[PDB]
Amino acid sequence: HWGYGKHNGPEHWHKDFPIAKGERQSPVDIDTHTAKYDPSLKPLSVSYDQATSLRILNNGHAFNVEFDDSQDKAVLKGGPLDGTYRLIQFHFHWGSLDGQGSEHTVDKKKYAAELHLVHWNTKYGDFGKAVQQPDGLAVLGIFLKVGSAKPGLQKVVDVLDSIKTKGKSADFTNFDPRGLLPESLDYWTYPGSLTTPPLLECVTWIVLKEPISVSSEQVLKFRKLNFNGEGEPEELMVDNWRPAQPLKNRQIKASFK
Numbered sequence: 001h002w003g004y005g006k007h008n009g010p011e012h013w014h015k016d017f018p019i020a021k022g023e024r025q026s027p028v029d030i031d032t033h034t035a036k037y038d039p040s041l042k043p044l045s046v047s048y049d050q051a052t053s054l055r056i057l058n059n060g061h062a063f064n065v066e067f068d069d070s071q072d073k074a075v076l077k078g079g080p081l082d083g084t085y086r087l088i089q090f091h092f093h094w095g096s097l098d099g100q101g102s103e104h105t106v107d108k109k110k111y112a113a114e115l116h117l118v119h120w121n122t123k124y125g126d127f128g129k130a131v132q133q134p135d136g137l138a139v140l141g142i143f144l145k146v147g148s149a150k151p152g153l154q155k156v157v158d159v160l161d162s163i164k165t166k167g168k169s170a171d172f173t174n175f176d177p178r179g180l181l182p183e184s185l186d187y188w189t190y191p192g193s194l195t196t197p198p199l200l201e202c203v204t205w206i207v208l209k210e211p212i213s214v215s216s217e218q219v220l221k222f223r224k225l226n227f228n229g230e231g232e233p234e235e236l237m238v239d240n241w242r243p244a245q246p247l248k249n250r251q252i253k254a255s256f257k
């Protein structure tokens with residue numbers, strides 16, 4: 001089964017998921033000088049004030065903070081998007097070392113980690129239907145660099161010991177995802193895919209220009225998570241990122257000059 005090890009990592013995924021070599025795979029390198037400023041791109045509308053977080057889960061590949069997506073409580077609109085996309089979960093990808101960890105890169109630079117806020121297009125009715133459509137998901141990607149602590153991240157970091165191993169979950173109510181956003185909502189956007197199997201080509205990627213800073217202690221605690229289940233040999237959950245994939249016949253657009 002797929003993962004991030006030497007024998008089941010990203011270079012093997014195409015054998016079970018041939019779309020891994022498809023025409024709109026993610027992540028990609030964002031070449032800042034080649035991205036095209038599009039003055040017609042609207043500002044992003046991030047409406048998270050009514051968000052209802054529920055639970056945090058170690059799924060063996062990352063951890064997901066899950067939200068109530070049965071109503072329009074936390075929605076992403078605007079930018080390149082038509083219609084309304086509901087927040088279903090967020091998760092991160094991170095490295096074994098501060099020098100790597102992000103999935104998208106910027107002029108080939110790898111950040112320490114990358115946050116993915118996952119939203120599905122409400123016109124399809126649920127996430128399972130949305131992933132089958134070329135405009136089914138909108139993922140807000142936010143880079144993490146190591147520096148000052150991110151206060152709005154600490155409640156996540158502090159609960160990780162309760163979900164150390166694959167299959168563990170914990171209550172995670174009353175968490176405010178607005179605390180994970182940078183100041184600016186300037187962004188790049190392009191059509192892409194899920195970055196894990198099944199790698200479906202259903203994502204409008206919206207990658208924020210401005211990273212958030214997290215402390216070395218915060219990212220160190222991510223690296224204490226385990227890919228394995230309890231009672232199995234310990235394998236640290238680190239380097240759970242897919243490398244940049246060929247851009248092929250796509251142009252990255254920028255919301256900002």
Ligand SMILES: CC1=CC(=O)NS(=O)(=O)O1
Pocket residue numbers: 002003004005006227228235
């Ligand atoms: C390095 C590694 C990563 C993974 O995803 N699965 S594994 O626990 O078999 O080994």
Ligand SMILES: CC1=CC(=O)NS(=O)(=O)O1
Pocket residue numbers: 099100107108109110111
């Ligand atoms: C150019 C570049 C290459 C790489 O792999 N990691 S990095 O973050 O040092 O930046």
Ligand SMILES: CC1=CC(=O)NS(=O)(=O)O1
Pocket residue numbers: 157160161162163164221222224225226
């Ligand atoms: C994942 C996790 C993070 C932490 O802070 N302590 S712990 O090593 O018990 O488990």
Ligand SMILES: CC1=CC(=O)NS(=O)(=O)O1
Pocket residue numbers: 116118137139193194195196197199203
């Ligand atoms: C659920 C989900 C799966 C994935 O692989 N990429 S994503 O960031 O769109 O979120």
Ligand SMILES: CC1=CC(=O)NS(=O)(=O)O1
Pocket residue numbers: 131194196197198
């Ligand atoms: C719900 C689930 C199924 C899917 O299609 N992609 S995912 O593996 O990211 O999560």
Ligand SMILES: CC1=CC(=O)NS(=O)(=O)O1
Pocket residue numbers: none
């Ligand atoms: C897990 C651990 C335990 C503690 O008490 N303080 S700390 O935040 O430095 O790291």
Ligand SMILES: [Zn+2]
Pocket residue numbers: 091092093116195
């Ligand atoms: Zn992701």
